[PDB]
C-alpha cells in the first residue's frame, strides 16, 4: 500500500520555510477536508482549502502565489485533486492497514510509594503503559466500590514511539484485610484488565 | 479544525543558511516516517509499518527542492525578515514504571522549538551519557514551532541523577531538566 504526498507549488518570481498538506478525516472518509499550508518564519502566507477550492493568500506575502497558482489549470487541478489522491487514497489504503489497525495492550502494574505501615497513609500508583490507541478508562477500587476521592491521573502521555502512558495515583490508608484493584479498559482488550494489591 | 483523524501527508521543512531540510509524514500526532535526504530512503518509525506500506523517497526529495526554492523567493520577497528565536521547554519522564535494577528508557520531550535547530544531550551525575540514545524528528505544532523527543536507555539506581541538557539559540545559557 503506497502513500501519496501533497505537492508543494513553486513560489512565483536564520530563515525557515515549511510546507504541509493536512487531511482532516471525519467518520472515516465520509467527510474529508484538505488544507495545504505554506509557512515562512512561522507565518502562514498562502493556503489551499478544499472548502474554498482554490489557493487564497493568507497574508500580503501570499498574493503573488495564490493568484498565479489559481491561473494555471495544470496547477489548480493538481492541488484540488489531492483531496482524493492524497487524503482518501492514504486513508483507505496504507492507513487502514497500519495506524488505523494498531492495537497495543496496556501494561498494568500497581505500586506502593512509601514502605508499607498498616493504619498509616500511603499512596498506590497504577502505571498503565505501552498502549495504543489513546482511548482508555482507568479506575481504582477498594473492596469492590469505585474510588473518586484522593484519586488523580496524569494527562495522556504521548511516548513518541506510537505508544501511550497514563499514571493513576490513589491516596489511601492500607488496613489489614482490604484489596485494592486497578481496573483498565482499552480497545485492544477483549475483557477489562484488573490488577490487585492486597493490604 | 474538528476531526476524528488527521494525517499530515507531507511535511517539508527547510532552513537557511546551512541547507537543513526535513521531510516527514505524521498521522494523529505520530511520525509514520522521515525520508533520509542523504541516503535517499524512506525510514519508518515502526518497522512493521514499512512492511505493509511504502513511500518513494523521491516524493520527498522533490518536495524539498520546491521548498528550498520557495524559501529563497520568500526571503527576498519579505526583504530578508529573519526568524525569531523561541525558548524551548523540556520535560523528562521514564517510559516504564521505574523499578531499581531494571533497564528502562528515560524520555526527554522538548517543545516550543523554533527555529528547528537544537542540541539535546543526556547527562548522568553531570557527565555526558549516550546509551542507546535515539532522537525523534521535529514534530510540527499548531503555532508552527516544533517539538522533539530524545531517548536514553538506563538502569535505575539511587546513586544516579539524570539531567536532560538542551541547547538553543533562544536560550542565553543551556537549560537542564533534572530528574
Amino acid at each position, epitope marked *: 500500500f*503506497e502513500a*501519496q*504526498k501533497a*505537492k*508543494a*507549488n*513553486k513560489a512565483v518570481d536564520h530563515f525557515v520555510y515549511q510546507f504541509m498538506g493536512e487531511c482532516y478525516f471525519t467518520n472515516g472518509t465520509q467527510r474529508i477536508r484538505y488544507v495545504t499550508r505554506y509557512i515562512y518564519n512561522r507565518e502562514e502566507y498562502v493556503r489551499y482549502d478544499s472548502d474554498v477550492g482554490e489557493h487564497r493568500a493568507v497574508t500580503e506575502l501570499g498574493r503573488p502565489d495564490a493568484e498565479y497558482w489559481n491561473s494555471q489549470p*495544470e496547477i489548480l487541478e*493538481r492541488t484540488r*485533486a489531492e483531496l482524493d*489522491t492524497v487524503c482518501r487514497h492514504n486513508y483507505e489504503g496504507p492507513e487502514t492497514h497500519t495506524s488505523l489497525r494498531r492495537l497495543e495492550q496496556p501494561n498494568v502494574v500497581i505500586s506502593l510509594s512509601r514502605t508499607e505501615a498498616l493504619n498509616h497513609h500511603n499512596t498506590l500508583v497504577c502505571s498503565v503503559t505501552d498502549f495504543y490507541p489513546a482511548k482508555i478508562k482507568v479506575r481504582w477500587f477498594r473492596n469492590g466500590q469505585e474510588e473518586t476521592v484522593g484519586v488523580s491521573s496524569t494527562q495522556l502521555i504521548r511516548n513518541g514511539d506510537w505508544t501511550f502512558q497514563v499514571l493513576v495515583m490513589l491516596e489511601m490508608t492500607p488496613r489489614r484485610g482490604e484489596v485494592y484493584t486497578c481496573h483498565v479498559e482499552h480497545p485492544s482488550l477483549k475483557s477489562p484488565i484488573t490488577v490487585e494489591w492486597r493490604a | 479544525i474538528e476531526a476524528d483523524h488527521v494525517g499530515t501527508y507531507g511535511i517539508s521543512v527547510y532552513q537557511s543558511p546551512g541547507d537543513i531540510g526535513q521531510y516527514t509524514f505524521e498521522f494523529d500526532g505520530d511520525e509514520l516516517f522521515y525520508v533520509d535526504l542523504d541516503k*535517499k530512503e524512506t525510514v519508518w518509525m515502526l518497522p512493521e509499518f514499512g512492511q505493509l506500506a511504502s513511500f*518513494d523517497p*523521491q*516524493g520527498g*526529495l*522533490q518536495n*524539498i*527542492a*520546491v521548498v*528550498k*526554492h520557495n524559501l529563497g523567493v520568500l526571503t527576498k520577497r519579505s526583504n530578508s525578515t529573519p526568524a525569531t528565536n523561541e525558548a524551548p521547554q523540556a520535560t523528562v519522564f521514564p517510559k516504564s514504571p521505574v523499578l531499581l535494577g531494571q533497564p528502562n528508557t528515560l524520555i526527554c520531550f522538548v517543545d516550543n522549538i523554533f527555529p528547528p535547530v537544537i542540541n539535546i544531550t543526556w547527562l548522568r551525575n553531570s557527565k555526558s551519557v549516550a546509551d542507546g540514545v535515539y532522537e525523534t524528528s521535529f514534530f510540527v505544532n499548531r503555532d508552527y514551532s516544533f517539538h522533539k523527543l530524545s531517548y536514553l536507555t538506563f538502569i535505575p539506581s539511587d546513586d544516579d541523577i539524570y539531567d536532560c541538557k538542551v541547547e538553543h539559540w533562544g536560550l542565553e545559557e543551556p537549560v537542564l531538566k533534572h530528574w
Partner: T-cell receptor, first 109, second 111 residues
Framework: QVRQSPQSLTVWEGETAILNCSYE??????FPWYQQFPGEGPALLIA?????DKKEDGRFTIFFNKREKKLSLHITDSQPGDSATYFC??????????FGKGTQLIIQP | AVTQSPRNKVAVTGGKVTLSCNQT?????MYWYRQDTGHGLRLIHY???????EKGDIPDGYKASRPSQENFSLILELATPSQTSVYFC???????????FGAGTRLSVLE
C-alpha cells in the same frame, strides 16, 4: 515497466492506426504519449489520467482501461506526416516518468 | 528551448566524454536519457535543481552534474563501446505534466 506493442506497424494512409500500451504497476495514474520524428527529440502528443477512460484531441484519442491496466492510442485518418515513433510513458503521483520501448509508425501512401 | 552539445561525437574507449545541456525554459527539473533500439528511452540521471542529482534506471557508468538551473551535464568518466547511443536531454517543471526534449546527440565510442 511499460510495455508497447508492436515494435513497428505499417498502416495504409486513411486507415486508423492503433498503438497498444500496457503497464504493470497499478498505482500509475498519468499516461502521456510522446511523438518522435526522425532526427528530432520526442514531444508530448496527447495524455490521459486514470480518472478518465478517454481523451480526444482531433485525430488522436487515448482509450484507457484501469482494470486491465491496458491503454491504447488511436490515430484516425492517418497521414504520411504521422509517420514517426510513438512513446507510451507512465507516472505515479507526479514523479519521474517511465517510458515504453516505443512503436514505429509507417503510413503508406 | 533545450540545446544539447555536442550533437555528434566520436570517442575512444577509455576516453572522457561530457555531454552538456542548456535549458532556457526556467525549468527546475532536467533529465538525461539514452535511446537504443530494443530499449526505447532510458533514464540515466536527473536533477531537481542546481547542486544535486538523482540516479535513473541505468545510472551505472555515468556521472552527472547540475552546476546551474540552466545546465545539466552528463559525464562519461571511462567511455566504453556500450555507451554508444543517441542521447537526449530534457527539462520540465516541478511535478510537470510535460517534458521538453533537446534534439539529440549521436555518440560513437570506438575501440
Amino acid at each position: 515497466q511499460v510495455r508497447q506493442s508492436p515494435q513497428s506497424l505499417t498502416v495504409w494512409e486513411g486507415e486508423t492506426a492503433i498503438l497498444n500500451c500496457s503497464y504493470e504497476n497499478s498505482a500509475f495514474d498519468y499516461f502521456p504519449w510522446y511523438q518522435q520524428f526522425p532526427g528530432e527529440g520526442p514531444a508530448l502528443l496527447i495524455a490521459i489520467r486514470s480518472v478518465s477512460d478517454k481523451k480526444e484531441d482531433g485525430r488522436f484519442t487515448i482509450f484507457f482501461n484501469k482494470r486491465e491496466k491496458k491503454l491504447s492510442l488511436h490515430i484516425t485518418d492517418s497521414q504520411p506526416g504521422d509517420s514517426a515513433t510513438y512513446f507510451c510513458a507512465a507516472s505515479k503521483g507526479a514523479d519521474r516518468l517511465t517510458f515504453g520501448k516505443g512503436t514505429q509508425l509507417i503510413i503508406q501512401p | 528551448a533545450v540545446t544539447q552539445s555536442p550533437r555528434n561525437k566520436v570517442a575512444v574507449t577509455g576516453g572522457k566524454v561530457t555531454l552538456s545541456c542548456n535549458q532556457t525554459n526556467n525549468h527546475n527539473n532536467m533529465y538525461w536519457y539514452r535511446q537504443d533500439t530494443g530499449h526505447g528511452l532510458r533514464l540515466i540521471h536527473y536533477s531537481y535543481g542546481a547542486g544535486s542529482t538523482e540516479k535513473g534506471d541505468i545510472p551505472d557508468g555515468y556521472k552527472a552534474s547540475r552546476p546551474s538551473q540552466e545546465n545539466f551535464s552528463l559525464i562519461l568518466e571511462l567511455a566504453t563501446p556500450s555507451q554508444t547511443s543517441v542521447y537526449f536531454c530534457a527539462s520540465g517543471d516541478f511535478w510537470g505534466d510535460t517534458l521538453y526534449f533537446g534534439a539529440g546527440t549521436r555518440l560513437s565510442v570506438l575501440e
